[PDB]
Amino acid sequence: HLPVTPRVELVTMQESDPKSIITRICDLMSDKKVQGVVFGDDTDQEAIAQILDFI
Amino acid sequence: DPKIVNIGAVLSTKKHEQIFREAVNQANFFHFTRKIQLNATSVTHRPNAIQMALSVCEDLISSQVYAILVSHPPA
Amino acid sequence: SYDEWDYDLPARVRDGIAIITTAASTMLSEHNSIPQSKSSCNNIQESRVYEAHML
């Protein structure tokens, strides 16, 4: 019922890196023009949030 | 045996990169080269933050830098 | 800590998607305007993305 319907592209990556994450998220950006991102991890790592925040 | 210990930097211009490498070589010459050697790597400032961070992870850290130097860009 | 048992990770992701699309729906209701924006990081941020603050 919500006025906008979601179009979703899902991708997974195995282990976290500043380079891997930055590259991939920008890569998904492409011309694609995504207006939102949700991130999730199996990891215990503190740092990750800040990185995505930087993006 | 020598061991090459990399250093890395981001600087305003290629001339300053040459200055960097020169200073590094002065450091190598004047301290024991038998035990250890220092190697220099550097890159010009990139237009966004992201190209540069990618540069650090790719262009610099792939060289195993023990430290990085940074300078304010021309503009 | 947050509990895994109460709600599993996909339920949580559903919450995230729901938040993004609900924000999109409310922003729509207010300005009748598409939130969609050019995603590419490498170039300058797309115009009218500066407008995004209200989101």
What is the layout of strands, in order, in the sheet containing B68-70?
Answer: B37-44, B4-11, B68-70
Resolution of the experimental model, in Å, one decimal: 14.1
C42 interfaces chain B, CB cutoff of 8 Å: yes
Q: Which two tokens stand for residue C4?
A: 């895994």
User: Obtained via which technique?
Assistant: cryo-EM
Q: Return d(Cα A51, Cα A49) in angstroms, integer.
A: 5
Cα dist from C39 to A5, B51, C28, C47, C55, whole Å = 19, 16, 19, 11, 16
A27 interfaces chain B, CB cutoff of 8 Å: no
Q: Look at residues B62, B61, C13, C42 and name the one whose alpha carbon lies nearest to residue A27.
A: C42
C14 interfaces chain A, CB cutoff of 8 Å: no
Q: Return d(Cα C53, Cα B26) in angstroms, integer.
A: 51
Place of tokens 């038998």: B34
User: Are B7 and B28 within 8 A, CB to CB?
Assistant: no
- What is the β-pairing status of strands B37-44 and B68-70? unpaired
Q: Which of C12, C25, C36 sits opposite A2 (nearest CB)?
A: C25
Q: How far is C51 from chain A (nearest CA, A)?
A: 13
CB < 8 Å from A in window 17-46 of C: 17, 20-22, 24-25, 28-29, 35-42
Place of tokens 């830098």: B65
3-state DSSP assignment of residue B64: coil
Q: Which of A18, A26, A54 sits opposite B57 (nearest CB)?
A: A18
Q: Return d(Cα B58, Cα B56) in angstroms, integer.
A: 6
Q: Return d(Cα B70, Cα C37) in angstroms, integer.
A: 33
Q: Is C4 labelled a binding residue?
A: yes
Q: Return d(Cα C30, Cα A44) in angstroms, integer.
A: 39
